Design a protein around this ligand. Structure first.
Ligand SMILES: [Ca+2]
Length: 1158
DNA sequence: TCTAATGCGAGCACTGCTATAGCAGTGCTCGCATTAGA
């Protein structure tokens, strides 16, 4: 509690409301969480226990990373599973669980509560801050105002930009030249506005110290300014007199130079700008009898004269709501909104029902990484858990590791929270690291008081663990110290030098380690165990993409391969993408001589200058490559981009060759990665060209997702690893290098946190008091970064130090090294001589801490060899293709195009297809009814459920046409059409659909015929011919061998008192008129679409079906069917026109039926 | 086949004056760090 937290003993920590746990670097934050979790599930503890035992769905644990929750969740399903087993056994011989066991009172019961929890884990309330938010939101959607169906907006950077241009458009275009020019001089365009405000606009809006009056228009301020400007433009258009008497030295007569300038600064304004008229003022006039009445210049140079704060203020207020409105309209949600709307929800009046709701679901909650919260979160958290009995709020984290300033993480809202909760705790021991390492860090950050210079972030030392007392690092002889400062010489030192030199030094010391390690003289030792240092143990922490390169370079210069683990580039701007783009163009059109030559020229294909030339002179060889490429397009068109690309590669033997070519692995895996992306994108485009286009776009405007990020190679694991301070939080490394840990960069933007109210304030006038406050907050941050930096190592760490100077003040005992975190701890605060550094370092310095001077080096080798025995081969299978079983359906016939057609709509009028034109003739006849399948299946629909029996309501019909989206005005023609077709004589004898009651029809029957013994198109042809006069029009056997099944739909099967029939309604073709629906023409079309096949198949179906249903049925006493109504060509009085009938041989069905089974 | 960043001061050169030297200010050349971080 109170002052200097208590050394948290997990097992006795009071799980009752509000506890702040500080877990220093390497202290067990994770082991502790776990323990606590178990304690809560089994309501263990004592007077320090929680009131009741909780469930998995009640222990709220929030983490920051998606990866964090996963890990955390994985770690907990394990401690449960174990504490549980150790509960059946009632014995544990491993730390935590034993002490816990001691605390348990009915092992038998725990084991069942635990077993339940284990089973529940797929729902543990372990979420990310955002996850926690959309959940509380979605449940209580009425309080929050949420939609039940939201779309998680992902970008928002483009949404923001667009809002920003809209802003500019509606606020600048309409502006008159005088104001316009002014704005223009403040920002050339909306891109530059955003550049100045983009940070804000995101997350909580800062408070503006001194905003403009809630109404000043651009127009107004302008006035005031102009007017302040011209009144002084008048009292100068009178330089008649200014030609003055009494002297001074500085002030020369080349003042007549200064003069005219402003005399001529009398344009029609348009710019708040005004080159220097220092001399002719009056404030200095005296500072250099003296001057007269232009004390109006003393007044112009007092008041700022700018449009800046005014426009800015307006922009963010507005740009924000543009973004907002847009996101609502689209129906979306960004991440900041998720937890933002949850804040506004706990603050609305309807905020108690909500706080209570939540508080009930989650009585106790563990917030991890808490040092990285921000006003919005904290507020969500106290409003729900603060001062609330029957609940507990464990906030665990470490203020010394709060480095996410740039994202939104507020160290001040952490410091406030620290004020509001009174129970403080700390983890005292540093498992994970060597004692010297632990000692020198503690020493370093112990120098001055308030090392992190914010009394609220006090630094308390830590003890090193016993299990690690034996760790030590030896090199070419004896134990090296845990922390070594390398120190450049000289008095001054620019940022550019201290880098070239430091990167140099750092790479040198690395091969020196690395090769002394191949020889056994650099050992990582734990007591009497030792292993040589490999590259997988060196690690270089770095502050930016540039520094990293600077390192990779000096390292590469010694042949020492490296990896920048924090690399963000995308695979789309890799040069390999460009080549893939040429390659695809080539494939999509090898016709164009030029675009192919380019693809063959890409380095990826590995050709020669001699190669390219000769292929240009050998026209037969070229058309060979052209075929090869036509071959690829084909695979592309059928199987995909990946499949095509793999074909190409196997041919030009790409992967094999590339890998042989230095750095060729990088390239090869990027190429594959592009293909994996290229393949998804293709399944969302129905053209190859579209994809190509898809590539270009991604090559011209990249860095989108984390998905187009570069994948790291398996092996990068044996490369020295160069990472950023940020990606290193969490990570552990045997040895680490800090080549540029002394750099600073003065904060110049006045965005600071108020020292008393702890809120964020943006000062739109760089008032020095605020920039000063901002700057403090800047090293307040670098110290935290330094603390994360020193802390990743286990055995050793060495950082580069230099008498760094940035002030262009001529080495005035400068060395503003005291403005860097490391500099501030070394020089205890006060600035020093370039030599005063050297003496401070020496000052804290024995075995644990030591220094050497930047001893540069050279020796291009990393003298390491190889050996290799590729004794490989691949399993070849000895089974073979043989036969294919399938489910077909009179598709053995109808060639594709129907790909996915029969799939999306199982009953589409597949028999139709096409457009319709200038056949409009001003009097509707059934031949002018919309052509094709959509309309075609509209018809079939008509006859699916009718009352063939009664007459045709025309209302009913107007409704069918109205619902199916056809013009009502078709009702006259259609109703007249339906009846005609109902009242026609199919088989002369009675017949006529109209005589068929329900009980005698079966619409759309669906059959499945097994067809064993492949059905060879030929063998079926012979008998089809013999028995059918129609199929005598012999082009058939157009399909290929198929064993399997045979699907099929029968439009209608009806009976006419003894005698079953097969009806097939066929809306079909727009062949002008009548002349096309006569017994031949039909019989004609019949063969065109080989529909004859359909009959025979369909009746073999009806045959089998009837035979199966009608016990003791005979084909020729019950069948006699097959009617084919070409719906069009059907008149009330022109029978045998439109209708077609057949009655399969009965001798055909016979053979046919057994042609299936044998 | 196209273009190719600013900007800030220094840094040295030179030019009035006026109680040879320091205080000042005019002007072109040039080197330097800039970004960051998920
Ligand atoms: Ca049909």
């Amino acid at each position: 509690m109170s002052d200097v937290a208590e050394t948290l003993d997990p097992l006795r920590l009071p799980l009752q409301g509000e506890r702040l746990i500080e877990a220093s670097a390497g202290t067990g934050k994770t082991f502790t969480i776990a323990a606590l979790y178990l304690r809560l599930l089994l309501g263990l503890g004592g007077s320090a226990a929680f009131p009741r035992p909780l469930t998995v769905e009640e222990l709220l644990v929030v983490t920051f990373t998606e990866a964090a929750t996963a890990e955390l969740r994985g770690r907990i399903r394990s401690n449960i599973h174990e504490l549980r087993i150790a509960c059946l056994r009632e014995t544990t011989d491993n730390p935590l669980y034993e002490r816990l066991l001691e605390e348990i009172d009915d092992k038998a019961q725990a084991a069942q509560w635990l077993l339940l929890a284990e089973r529940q884990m797929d729902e543990a309330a372990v979420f990310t801050i955002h996850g926690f938010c959309q959940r509380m939101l979605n449940l209580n959607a009425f309080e929050s105002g949420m939609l039940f169906e939201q779309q998680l907006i992902e970008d928002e950077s483009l949404l923001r930009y667009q809002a920003c241009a809209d802003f500019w458009r509606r606020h600048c275009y309409p502006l008159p030249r005088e104001i316009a020019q002014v704005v223009f001089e403040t920002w050339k365009g909306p891109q530059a506005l955003l550049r100045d405000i983009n940070r804000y606009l995101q997350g909580e809006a800062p408070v503006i110290k001194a905003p403009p009056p809630d109404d000043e228009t651009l127009a107004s301020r302008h006035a005031q300014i102009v007017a302040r400007i011209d009144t002084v433009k008048q009292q100068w258009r009178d330089a008649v007199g200014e030609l003055d008497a009494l002297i001074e030295s500085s002030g020369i007569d080349r003042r007549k130079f200064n003069r005219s300038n402003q005399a001529k600064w009398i344009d029609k304004i348009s710019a708040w700008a005004e080159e220097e008229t220092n001399s002719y003022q009056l404030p200095e006039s005296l500072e250099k009898p003296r001057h007269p009445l232009f004390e109006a210049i003393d007044q112009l140079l007092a008041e700022p004269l700018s449009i800046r704060d005014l426009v800015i203020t307006r922009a963010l207020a507005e740009i924000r709501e543009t973004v907002a409105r847009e996101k609502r309209r689209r129906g979306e949600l960004g991440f900041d909104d998720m937890l933002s709307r949850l804040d506004s929800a706990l603050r609305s009046e309807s905020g108690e029902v909500l706080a209570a709701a939540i508080r009930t679901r989650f009585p106790v909650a563990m917030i991890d990484e808490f040092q990285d919260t921000d006003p919005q979160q904290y507020r969500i958290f106290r409003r729900i858990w603060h001062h609330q009995p029957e609940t507990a709020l464990l906030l665990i984290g470490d203020p010394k590791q709060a480095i996410y300033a740039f994202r939104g993480a507020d160290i001040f809202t952490y410091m406030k929270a620290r004020s509001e909760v009174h129970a403080h705790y700390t983890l005292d021991t540093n498992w994970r690291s060597a004692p010297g390492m632990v000692n020198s860090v503690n020493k370093l950050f112990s120098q001055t008081d308030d090392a992190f210079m914010f009394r609220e972030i006090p630094f308390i030392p830590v003890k090193s663990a016993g299990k690690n007392q034996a760790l030590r690092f030896v090199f070419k002889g004896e134990t090296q110290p845990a922390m070594k400062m390398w120190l450049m010489e000289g008095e001054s030192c620019g940022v550019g030098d201290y880098q070239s030199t430091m990167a140099q030094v750092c790479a040198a010391q690395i091969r020196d380690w690395l090769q002394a390690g191949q020889r056994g003289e650099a050992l990582l030792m734990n007591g009497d165990d030792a292993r040589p240092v490999r590259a997988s143990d060196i690690s270089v922490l770095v502050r930016s993409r540039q520094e990293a390169a600077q390192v990779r370079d000096a390292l590469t210069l010694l042949e020492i391969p490296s990896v920048y683990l924090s690399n963000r580039d995308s695979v789309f701007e890799t040069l390999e993408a460009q080549e893939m783009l040429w390659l695809l163009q080539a494939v999509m059109t090898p016709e164009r001589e030029n675009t192919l030559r380019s693809a063959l020229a890409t380095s990826m294909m590995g050709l020669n200058a001699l190669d390219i030339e000769t292929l240009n002179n050998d026209e037969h060889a070229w058309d060979v490559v052209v075929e090869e490429f036509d071959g690829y397009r084909q695979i592309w068109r059928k199987r995909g981009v990946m499949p095509m690309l793999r074909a190409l590669m196997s041919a030009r033997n790409i992967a094999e060759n590339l890998l042989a070519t230095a750095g060729g692995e990088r390239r090869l895996t990027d190429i594959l990665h592009i293909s994996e992306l290229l393949q998804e994108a293709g399944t969302q485009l129905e053209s190859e060209h579209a994809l190509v286009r898809w590539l270009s776009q991604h090559i011209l405007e990249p860095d989108s997702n984390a998905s187009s990020q570069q994948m790291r190679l398996e092996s990068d694991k044996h490369l020295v690893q160069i990472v950023t301070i940020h990606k290193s939080k969490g990570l552990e490394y045997p040895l680490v290098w800090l080549p540029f840990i002394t750099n600073f960069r003065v904060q110049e933007q006045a965005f600071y946190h108020d020292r008393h109210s702890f809120e964020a304030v943006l000062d739109l006038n760089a008032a020095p008091e605020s920039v000063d406050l901002a700057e403090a907050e800047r090293l307040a941050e670098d110290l935290r970064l330094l603390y994360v930096a020193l802390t990743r190592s286990v055995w050793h760490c060495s950082l580069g130090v230099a008498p760094l100077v940035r002030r262009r003040g001529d080495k005035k005992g400068d060395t503003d090294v005291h403005q860097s975190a490391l500099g501030r701890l070394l020089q205890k605060g006060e600035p020093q001589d370039a030599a005063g550094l050297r003496t401070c370092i020496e000052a804290l310095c024995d075995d644990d801490i030591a220094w050497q001077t930047a001893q540069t080096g050279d020796n291009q080798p990393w003298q390491v060899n190889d050996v290799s025995t590729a004794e490989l081969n691949a399993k070849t299978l000895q089974r073979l293709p043989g036969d294919n079983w399938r489910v077909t359906s009179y598709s053995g016939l109808q060639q594709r195009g129907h790909g996915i057609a029969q799939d999306l709509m199982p009953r589409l009028d597949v028999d139709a297809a096409g457009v319709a034109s200038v056949v409009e003739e001003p009097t509707l006849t059934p031949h002018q009814f919309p052509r094709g399948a959509s309309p075609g299946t509209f018809l079939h629909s008509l006859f699916e459920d009718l009352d063939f029996t009664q007459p045709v309501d025309p209302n009913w019909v107007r409704e069918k046409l109205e619902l199916g989206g056809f013009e009502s005005q078709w009702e006259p023609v259609l109703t007249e059409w339906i009846t005609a077709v109902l009242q026609a004589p199919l088989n002369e004898t009675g017949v006529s659909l109209s005589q068929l009651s329900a009980r005698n029809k079966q619409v759309e029957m669906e059959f499945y015929l097994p067809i064993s013994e492949p059905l060879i198109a030929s063998q079926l042809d012979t008998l089809i011919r013999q028995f059918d006069p129609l199929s005598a029009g012999c082009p058939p056997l157009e399909f290929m061998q198929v064993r399997g099944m045979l699907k099929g739909f029968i439009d209608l099967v009806f009976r006419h008192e003894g005698r079953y029939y097969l009806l097939d309604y066929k809306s079909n073709w727009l062949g002008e008129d009548s002349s096309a629906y006569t017994q031949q023409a039909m019989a004609a079309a019949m063969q065109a679409h080989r529909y004859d096949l359909q009959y025979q198949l369909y009746t073999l179906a009806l045959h089998r079906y009837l035979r199966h249903r009608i016990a003791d049925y005979d084909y020729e006493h019950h069948f006699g069917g097959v009617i084919y109504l070409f719906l069009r060509g059907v008149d009330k009085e022109h029978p045998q026109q439109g209708i077609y009938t057949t009655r399969p041989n009965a001798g055909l069905i016979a053979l046919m039926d057994e042609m299936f089974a044998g």
